[PDB]
Symmetry: D2
Subunit: 115 residues, 4 copies
């Protein structure tokens, strides 16, 4: 129900091998590790969670943009990109978090559909 897609705006391609970490805000206001992975050759990361596990709450997706650019020999501006949102407050949805990367800029968009 949670998918991440990363695109490279310099090369016009999927962003491959980008580390992604997902956290859920605990009752004590701490970030608990929730899931992680790396984008595939299509720049996508699936299978982060299940419907039973993906309960109502505030989630943070942290995308390691810095390592990505370093490996291309580019010194980027941001340390990482993070996306923080309340999920599921009126029932289960499918969430797609898209990011579009340039060295000194990024865009992030959410597409939310009802399964």
């Amino acid at each position: 129900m949670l998918m991440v897609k990363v695109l490279d705006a310099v090369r016009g391609s999927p962003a491959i091998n980008v580390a992604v970490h997902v956290f859920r805000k605990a009752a004590d206001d701490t970030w608990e590790p929730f899931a992680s992975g790396k984008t595939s050759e299509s720049g996508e990361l699936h299978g982060l969670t299940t419907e039973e596990e993906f309960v109502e709450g505030i989630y943070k997706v942290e995308i390691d943009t810095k390592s990505y650019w370093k490996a291309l020999g580019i010194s980027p501006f941001h340390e990482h990109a993070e996306v923080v949102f309340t999920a599921n407050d009126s029932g289960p949805r499918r969430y797609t978090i898209a990011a579009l990367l340039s060295p000194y800029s990024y865009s992030t968009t959410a597409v939310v559909t009802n399964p």
Copy 2:
């Protein structure tokens, strides 16, 4: 009343010396030249028009992004970027450039 600002998302800087051409849709259905220039060291282009000459109508702003990227030794995707709009109204047209993506935003104030 019409201002263009261009930013480079790759180098984190104003996009300098970018060519911009502005057209107005004519009585028939043709685009007649209206103004043009090149962005300054701050990536801005001002003084394209006056309140008297800037009448209601449809305008097209064409930004030569291709020549900009070629000068930097980067192969771009687009031939150019075009913004077409009907014309309160001070208009700032902003464009943020990457080689395979651009965004454009209008800020309209009174």
Copy 3:
């Protein structure tokens, strides 16, 4: 080999029923109609062209953003969004043209992959 995807940044959803017209620049510097369609419930438009037909050249994709916003009761800034590019100058590629729409802003991104 040419696909168009349109997203709505106000609603966080695919942009459905957006008219798209594709043109190819002729030898005499005129725009010849090449293909058209409307985005599906996923905000995508496939099947615009074939590999044999999609020859080297300059193509223009015109997306009718204005009609889309009008039908939602919103008066938008742009008349339409158009994307103009040289295609296929070093061999056949798959082209995805993505657009992200807000009433006073749009973004367009190209993803080019080798089939």
Copy 4:
């Protein structure tokens, strides 16, 4: 040396009266408050720091986008927008806001 500019992509206007909070990463690994304010009628926030206090380090700029959209009667997706960067250097951090998408760009000049 650090400036924030926020634009509203829905209404085509500066994003006015948006709360911004700036933090510096401390010796340990904590974010200690550094500066804050609200954007002006032009969607800008200036005078957050001085050249003496703005030393090398990692900084986080947090933009309260959620409160902005709620005031307009629009349900937004994000809790806020964060920009984290290592700190030439006049820094303009620009953010362009829509309810379900935002972009952020840095313009860094000397």
